[PDB]
Design a protein around this ligand. Structure first.
Ligand SMILES: COc1cccnc1N1C[C@H]2C(=O)N(C)C(=N)N[C@@]2(c2cc(-c3cccc(C#N)c3)cs2)C1
Length: 387
């Protein structure tokens, strides 16, 4: 651990997302910002809202600069573009001038109960709004300082429900800006290439449920793209993959029958305190393209990752969960479900993403999450989808 100042600087949980503290303006205005590798805009609440107890007040910042340009993002929010000095208290010790979308209008964006007031898009300029000319925060940070072009994330799921007070006092993980902290993982780090720089796109080449090959044309796994997104709660899979995966997961866990509502992620399932039958649920392995030709590696998660802990409607002593794997019509999304099992390194400098077993992943005495390799795999480029 060579970045102790950034270790444990995150708070939150999968369902609400994870945020880091930041400051904007002069004098500095403190705000909690959601860490989102699935977008590329730095946007903060900049006007009163029922669900916000604080917001960015441009008129109180001497360093605020108006860009005289609006921005609309369909939930959804509308705002006014500008720039200001920004810092991350528990981050690198620098201050940078970055673009800021001051949110003045929003719909279903801010969440009552949540403790965040803005969002930090860490992806590339290609997907920034209004267009790619709006330099993302990390791009500004790297251009203005000596911080290495790389960040890593350790999202820590508690393994049980966290009430209002607990989620505010608990450590939700770490975001290491400009480096890799060895205390956040065990074993080796394995890297998969960033196919293209817009979202953090990757290529999945094989999928297994308890070692059994899902056996689909690998292109299906990346239709129409596969990305790593801290801003998504679930592990989302393309419609056809979801259907096959669910069929296989039901088959593996067939000793117990669950209602359709459970598999749709709509209703929770509960078990007497401490008796969750983790062992009847299968582990899930995603093989990713390796850095070497014809070579792949796999990341394996447990039901402790894909069954999201939720508080029982009667706040009883039962341990309850919701199925956190769902379908997508926009490709595979490796959200918090996947990320909570691993320390993820976004090596922008070498256009690659690293995975290592997380020091904080939830498991039992019989199984653990894993990152293993290498495996001989052919025609992996063919697994990538082309419009
Ligand atoms: C390309 O997408 C964007 C362009 C410009 C501005 N915002 C964008 N977003 C898309 C949105 C989206 O659907 N995903 C999945 C995403 N990763 N980020 C966006 C948003 C994420 C959230 C949000 C809120 C609360 C918890 C979690 C949790 N966990 C995520 C609110 S908007 C921001």
């Amino acid at each position: 651990g060579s970045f102790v100042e950034m270790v444990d600087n995150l708070r939150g949980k999968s369902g609400q997302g994870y945020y880091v503290e930041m400051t904007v303006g002069s004098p500095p205005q403190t705000l909690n910002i959601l860490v989102d590798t699935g977008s590329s805009n730095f946007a903060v609440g900049a006007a009163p809202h029922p669900f916000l107890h604080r917001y960015y007040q441009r008129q109180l910042s001497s360093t605020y600069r108006d860009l005289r340009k609006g921005v609309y993002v369909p939930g959804k929010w509308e705002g006014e573009l500008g720039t200001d000095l920004v810092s991350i208290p528990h981050g690198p010790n620098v201050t940078v001038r970055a673009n800021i979308a001051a949110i003045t209008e929003s719909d279903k964006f801010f969440i009552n109960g949540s403790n965040w007031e803005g969002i930090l898009g860490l992806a590339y300029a290609e997907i920034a709004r209004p267009d790619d000319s709006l330099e993302p925060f990390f791009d500004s940070l790297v251009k203005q300082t000596h911080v290495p072009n790389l960040f890593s994330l350790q999202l820590c799921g508690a393994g049980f429900p966290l009430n209002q007070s607990e989620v505010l006092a608990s450590v939700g993980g770490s975001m290491i800006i400009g480096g890799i902290d060895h205390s956040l993982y065990t074993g080796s780090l394995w890297y998969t290439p960033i196919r293209r720089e817009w979202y953090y796109e990757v290529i999945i080449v094989r999928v297994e449920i308890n070692g059994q090959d899902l056996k689909m044309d690998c292109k299906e796994y990346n239709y129409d793209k596969s990305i790593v997104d801290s801003g998504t709660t679930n592990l989302r899979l393309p419609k056809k993959v979801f259907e096959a995966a669910v069929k296989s997961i039901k088959a593996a866990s067939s000793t117990e029958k669950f209602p359709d509502g459970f598999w749709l992620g709509e209703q929770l399932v509960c078990w007497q305190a401490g008796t969750t039958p983790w062992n009847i649920f299968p582990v899930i392995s995603l093989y990713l393209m390796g850095e070497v030709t014809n070579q792949s590696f796999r990341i394996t998660i447990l039901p402790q990752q894909y069954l999201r802990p939720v508080e029982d409607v009667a706040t009883s002593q039962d341990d309850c969960y919701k199925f956190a794997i769902s379908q997508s019509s926009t490709g595979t999304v490796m959200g918090a479900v996947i990320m909570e099992g691993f320390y993820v390194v976004f090596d922008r400098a070498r256009k690659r993403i690293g995975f290592a077993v997380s020091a904080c992943h939830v498991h039992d005495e019989f199984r653990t999450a894993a990152v293993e390799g290498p495996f001989v795999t052919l025609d992996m480029e063919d697994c990538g989808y082309n419009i």
